[PDB]
């Protein structure tokens with residue numbers, strides 16, 4: 071059996087500058103020999119090319135979902151952005167039923183959400199689109215409950231989003247701030263119900279301070295040394311008439327973890343974090359499904375991905391291995407399989423334990439040698455058609471923002487890569503060597519401070535097949551087509567990416 075392997079060097083990309091560039095400063099003679107011998111190109115792993123907004127750096131979850139899917143997998147922010155840009159949003163059934171509930175009960179529409187452009191949990195421009203829809207459908211009373219950010223965006227930036235939003239209310243002639251809460255209170259995720267109950271009480275016009283304007287309460291908070299995230303919830307005088315029977319709520323956050331708790335308070339009948347009388351006849355709508363204990367109408371339902379690489383392998387009676395150390399094990403399993411835990415038929419997996427250290431600069435090789443020794447043991451069985459391997463080190467060590475250890479991490483991975491790839495070539499097989507986004511390519515700012523994040527840089531591709539030319543550009547969704555091409559397996563129509571090998 072001739073194996074084909076995808077080998078993901080996590081957080082390893084192409085960047086022109088050598089300054090703070092561990093990829094370029096490392097001694098990587100195996101990678102370099104493969105790169106000089108075999109066909110090569112580079113592909114995009116950030117922004118629109120992987121289903122993220124323009125200018126947004128790639129990441130492991132979105133990267134491995136795009137790799138495994140063989141298509142661009144649109145993440146929530148972009149999905150919703152595009153729904154707004156092309157009209158479907160204003161047609162959405164769930165939002166229009168929310169509105170029909172209010173219109174038909176002569177009650178109130180409430181909107182909850184993180185009021186920033188952070189884009190991790192929400193985007194405030196989706197609030198504006200909801201205001202427009204409500205206005206088009208003639209709703210009269212819209213109450214906006216602002217949760218302030220300061221965490222995904224500058225720590226004192228709330229006043230500018232509030233200012234713009236107040237102009238939106240005036241421009242559309244609809245909506246008002248009813249309550250204002252730091253995300254500390256409204257978006258807690260550790261079952262600290264005391265914090266939540268403060269946000270609830272302000273939303274509901276029960277117990278809270280009151281100020282005349284959103285600006286005034288935030289400015290008062292700044293004065294006491296409490297920035298955005300930590301603003302004590304408050305009610306806006308004469309602009310809050312409570313959440314009453316018959317009302318509707320639309321929560322525009324798309325990220326589940328920090329939105330679930332507040333939603334359980336309102337719309338989990340079994341909620342017992344503290345005592346409540348829940349609203350009767352409440353239409354509670356969430357932009358996504360936050361958990362299965364919230365009785366909500368879901369605005370953007372999850373889409374299951376059919377025919378990821380692993381499902382195609384299965385349906386061609388191939389065997390596959392997923393292998394990584396702990397830190398990238400969900401990536402090569404769950405995310406690779408399109409957000410599915412269950413193994414495919416003919417799939418087996420190998421988890422290697424990562425070291426238990428606070429930061430991986432303390433052991434730059436991590437468990438890369440044991441991953442490689444596991445993989446060698448597996449290949450010696452001679453029964454694998456497909457391998458998906460991730461070497462975690464460059465991303466996990468690179469996050470430390472320390473150059474010499476990130477270099478050593480890369481050098482450790484290069485030693486393992488030589489052993490893995492030479493064994494595969496020995497077996498008359500093929501490797502695709504690539505990455506899921508950048509990081510170790512830049513671990514220093516231009517002024518030599520630690521830089522600890524991913525990059526937007528494009529990622530290398532090496533395909534270890536002689537006498538073939540790669541396409542000049544492409545994207546992560548092209549990698550699984552390239553695997554199928556190497557395996558001579560037919561590619562189904564719902565994999566819309568394209569093999570990197572030219573024909």
Ligand SMILES: [Mn+2]
Nearest residue numbers: 080129130506
């Ligand atoms: Mn990654």
Ligand SMILES: [Mn+2]
Nearest residue numbers: 081130465469
């Ligand atoms: Mn990372």
